[PDB]
């Protein structure tokens, strides 16, 4: 029952969808664990808890792009469990941007992983797509967080972490 | 470190709350799968899709108003695997509103025992919290999926599934 | 053939609603009854004819979102006769707002019973509809009559109840 | 204690007055539950309940215009018990119609007769009053759920009353 | 002289509105000391100065509702003396934070009394009255100033307390 | 640790201030007694009921900003028991109004002796603050309450009285 649609568009590459999805679900995941850990009473970070939750909805954002991809291509969405978050707590905002880089770097490679099973097949069009949509953003957030991770060195613990708290809510 | 928020608030109800936000994630991944399975090019219903993909983001919506609620009541959110859903196809239009009326219903149920767990402690607030911001819209969800099966019965396969996925993409 | 839609619904509780419905189309056509006998020639206060038809109407609109409501848990409506109301012609403007507040007190009962009926049920849902919809109108109803007619002991029979007339098309 | 305003008003126009409004509320409650029947899960004809619900208020609306005449012409309004409806489920959709034909019909004999009494007295507002207010408006109705009829016995039952309902809905 | 209005409405719940009055009043009373003493020379923190005369205003609210709950149910209000507050100085910022934290689950404790006495007695429209009025706003209130105090903690004395000052005036 | 903003500022005056406020709140609570009291079901005077509430907020208005004045003098607030009102019920709004005139000279005197603690000392600011913002309002007030006594004599009891409160309530 091969798709109408389906033209060069490899096996491998269609598994590596399906695996992307679960990674960026996976992501997102752990960006809503976030979210709600700075809107703990006991951390009371709003400023991070609306950076996590916008990022949240950004992976989120990210699998479905995936999935209407999968689909345009004539390949079949196959889900699987999306595994909990690495911690229930995520201590510090520099802990838990130190953890968001750590995470995107996750998800870049993987991307750039399926860029090469996709080239490996002349799927000129995927690379494309990926390179687009997907590789520009991680460098881009990439360097965000980074930024993100130097400023709260900088500004230190206590007062500092309030302040950056509030530039992350403006 | 019992939390400095915390006020009639029962160690039960606090695992109930976090059991339910599992349940309204997974209800969110069904419908996510939903939503894509009737993107795919040989079912290509795409008033269903928006259908399964809004209730998709509403499931959504109320698992992080859960994770706001234990916060404010000094819970502590843990969050467990989202396991995938049932299946990976849902067949006809019919057969996907069949499947989300036994969802919402589960949910619901779910949903009446955590009402019971409160209650039984006297947590009138948590209660009232559950009666109108997810009780309320459980009964209407059922009602309003019921009246869909109902007139895809009706319509009958073919033509008429394809006037109701107008019906839904209006 | 038990509603697809039925879930914690009780036999008792669908048949209290058939009840609470005949009521409320009861306290309807009697004030639909004094909106006309205060029209009269004889009578011709047209202050107390309003505030009686929009009485009526609202008693109208609440016997139809009761029945909204049950067709929302899949219960079923069954109609009876509507009694013709107590008297045909109901005396002064005080005198009708006695029977009012008579009136209204007995619808307000009637739910109290059907509040007890659903709670024994563990209706969860049932208990907030008829709180949020139904038993905090009867307090602010019977609070409202109960000032007409305590105003209307004190502006006293003819100019006083011209007045208050006036009050009342206001 | 005749009214001051009574000339040239027979106590036959009177009563039939009287017999017509509880006609009137009569056909109100049986389009009523037309109403709230084709609002049931397993019926889930929305356009139908909307055109019912609306022959209701337009009912109501013609029983209190008559209750208004009675009282400009010093008759004295008398009600009498509004008898449940015939049925308490209605069919398919041309069943309903069907029903809904037979009842207009018996509405305008009734009237007609109304207008026999009142010309036999040469009440010759009355007749007016009756023809301008009544008698047009049930010809234009009769026609319209003909029409009604005669376009559901053409589009069938299934897909062709859901197109219908989608009509009435507009 | 029982009041025509009351019905279902118990002595002990009366006189529950009673005292959860004066409470409400302490309350508002605190409030405004705390107010004023953050608008001293010598302490100088007009955001406090802010954020507790606005609580102070929504104490007042809340009795005066209750007064008039009092008098929609046919209670009687019965006012005792206002006592005047624990302190005449508040100390620090975060000395004045916790110590609303503790008034405000004072109040909440002695409103979650009140709701189980009008519970015990089945007045099921009380019950909700204090839920979607009272219950609610404590639970948010509590979380509020939890936050509130943990940001305290986190900005220190001296140039902290300036900072959230100015958030608190914003 | 006198402040650092005192200069010829009393310790006389600043107790006599202190004293002022007490007096203020209590006219504050006098009046809401007397605002709830016109709203009972057995009273129901509305325009009276808005007249002292809108007094109440008039003293407790005037209390705030006698706090306010004494830190711009560098005094220190200290606040007592505010004592119930004189009286539970009020009688009839002729009754009230009596009172309030007794109520409003008391505050009155209050203020002119407080004048004459701070000329004493001469505290001519304290004297300019005193008249322009405290006794001229108090000749206004006596006088508009004693016109408002004036006209209920001339309108009696009944619907005289009925008629004055809606003209308080315009
Ligand atoms: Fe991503
Ligand atoms: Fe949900
Ligand atoms: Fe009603
Ligand atoms: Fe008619
Ligand atoms: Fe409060
Ligand atoms: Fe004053």
Redesign the interface.
């Known amino acids: 029952?091969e798709?109408?649609?389906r033209q060069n568009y490899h096996q491998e590459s269609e598994a590596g969808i399906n695996r992307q999805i679960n990674m960026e679900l996976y992501a997102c995941?752990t960006y809503?664990?976030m979210a709600?850990?700075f809107?703990?009473?006991?951390?009371?970070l709003?400023g991070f808890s609306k950076f996590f939750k916008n990022s949240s909805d950004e992976e989120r954002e990210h699998a479905?792009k995936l999935?209407?991809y999968?689909?345009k291509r004539?390949g079949?969405?196959?889900?699987?469990?999306?595994?909990?978050?690495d911690r229930?707590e995520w201590g510090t905002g520099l802990d838990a941007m130190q953890v968001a880089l750590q995470l995107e770097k996750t998800v870049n490679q993987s991307l750039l992983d399926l860029h090469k099973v996709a080239g490996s097949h002349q799927d000129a069009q995927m690379c494309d797509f990926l390179e687009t949509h997907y590789l520009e953003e991680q460098v881009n957030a990439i360097k965000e967080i980074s930024d993100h991770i130097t400023q709260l060195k900088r500004v230190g613990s206590?007062?500092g972490?309030?302040?950056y708290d509030?530039r992350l809510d403006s």
């Open positions: 029952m798709s109408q649609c995941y809503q664990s709600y850990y809107d703990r009473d006991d951390v009371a709003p479905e999935m209407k999968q689909n004539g079949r969405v196959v889900l699987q469990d999306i595994k909990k978050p229930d206590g007062l972490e309030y302040e509030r």
